[PDB]
Design a protein around this ligand. Sequence first.
Ligand SMILES: [Cu+2]
Ligand SMILES: [Cu+2]
Lengths: 269, 268
Amino acid sequence: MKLSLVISTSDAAFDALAFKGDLRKGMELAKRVGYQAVEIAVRDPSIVDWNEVKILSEELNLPICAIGTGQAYLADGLSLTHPNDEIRKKAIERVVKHTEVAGMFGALVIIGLVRGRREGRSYEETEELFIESMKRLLELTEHAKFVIEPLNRYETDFINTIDDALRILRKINSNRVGILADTFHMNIEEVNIPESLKRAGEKLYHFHVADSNRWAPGCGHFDFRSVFNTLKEIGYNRYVSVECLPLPGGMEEAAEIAFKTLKELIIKL
Amino acid sequence: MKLSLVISTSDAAFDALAFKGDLRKGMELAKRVGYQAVEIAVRDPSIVDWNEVKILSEELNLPICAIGTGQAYLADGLSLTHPNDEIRKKAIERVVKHTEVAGMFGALVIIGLVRGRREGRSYEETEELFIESMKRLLELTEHAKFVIEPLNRYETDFINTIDDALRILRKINSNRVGILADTFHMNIEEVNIPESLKRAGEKLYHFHVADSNRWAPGCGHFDFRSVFNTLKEIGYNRYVSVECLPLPGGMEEAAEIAFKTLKELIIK
Ligand SMILES: [Cu+2]
Ligand SMILES: [Cu+2]
C-alpha cells in the first residue's frame, strides 16, 4: 500500500496563478510530510498547462495517482446521466479531456458526482443511462482507467454503496473500471465496512480516507484498524489517498496528522 | 478491436430503391459472415430516409461505424480546398449533412478525397485552406468526429502520409479530428508501417484493410501480421473495416475471405 494526499486547487479559469500556486504548495507539502503521490481535482482540464504540471511532478518525484472530475457537475452542471442528451454528450466530452490528462500521469479518472443524480427518475433508467455513458467512454479511450466512487445519500441518490457499484461493474464488464471506496461515505452508507470491502475484493482500485467528521484520519471515531486489517486480507496494494477537510488546524496540520495515523496502521500490518 | 465491412450502395438520388436494396443486402451479408458493424459511403445524404436505415440497423443488431464522403468529390466536384469559395462553401455544407447522418449512428465521418487536391497551388496554400474548412466544420457541428485518410500519390497530392496527417492535426488542435490509415495506401506511401502506426498512436481513430492489390486481405502479399501485432501493442480497440475490391470471386466471397483472414489474426 502507498499513501497519497488530495490537494485542493483553485479553478484555473479564473486565476491561473492561484491554481499553479495552490498546486505547488500542495505538492511541496505532500513531499515534506512523506506522501508517495498526490491526487488532484479539476473542473475543466482544457484551461490548464499540463506540461508545466508534469515538470513539477518530475521535479518533486511525486506522481499524480488520480484525477477528480466532480466540479464538472457542481460548477458546470455536466452529468453522464443528464436527461438532456446534449448535456450527456458534453459530459462525456469533458471526461475524455480528463482522460487525456490522466494519460500523461498514468492516473486513475474518478467518476464521482459527474455521474449525476436520479432527478425524479427510476434507479433503473438512471443506471441504464450511466452504463451507456461508461461504455461510450471505454470505446473512446484506449488506456484510461476509471473508478466509480459510491457517495452518501446527501450528495447523490445514485450509487450510494459498494454493492451498487459492484452491480454496475458486472454490467459494464471491463477491467478498466473499478471502485473507489471512501471511509467518510462508507461510515454512513455501509452496514459492515470490512464485509463490503471483501465483496469488492480485486475491484477495489483506489481508496479515500477521512474520519467520521471528514477531518484528518485520527480526529473522529472511525474504526480504521478494522479497515486496514481487511485491506491486508484482500491484498490491497494500491493507493490510500487522504481526502479530508483541512481540520484540525489547517491544510498542513491535517495532512501531517493523517499521515501519522495511516503510517501507524500500515506498518503494524 | 472490432471488424466492420464497407458495403457499396447505388446513389439514391438516381435510384432510391436500389440504394435500399444494396444496403439491405450488404448489411445482411455482413451479419451473416460475422462482421460487428458496417461502413457506408454516400454522395449526398439529404436524399435518403435515414430513419428507415436506423430501423434496419437496429433490427440486425449491426451498427454503422463510419460514413464515407468521397463521391461528393468524384461525382459532384465538391472539395474542402476548392479555389472557388462558393463551391468550397457547398462542400462544407454537404459534409455537415454527412455529420447529421453520422450523428444518428454514433459514426465517424471520413475526410478522404473530399479534401481535394493542390490543383497547381503550393502545398502550404492548399493546407491552410483545408485547415480553415475543418475549423469551419468543427464550428458548424457540435459532436461530429472526423477522420483524415492519407491517400496514395495517384489519388491525390495533398496528405499522402500518416506523418503529414499528424502535422496537420496538430494545427487543427481538436480531438474531434483523427486519422484513418488504409493498408493498400500505406503499402505505397509509408516507409515502415508499424513505425508509422506507432507514431499515430491514439490519433489513429479508424482503420481500412485491403491487400497489396486491394483484393480481400490474404489475397496479395501485404504483411497483416505485423500490422495487427502493432495494433495490439498500442491498445487499438476501435474498428478495422474491410474496404477492398470485390475480388476474388465477387463481393460476398471477398467479404468471407477477408473476415477469415482478419479474425484469425485478431484472435491470435
Ligand atoms: Cu472521496
Ligand atoms: Cu480506405
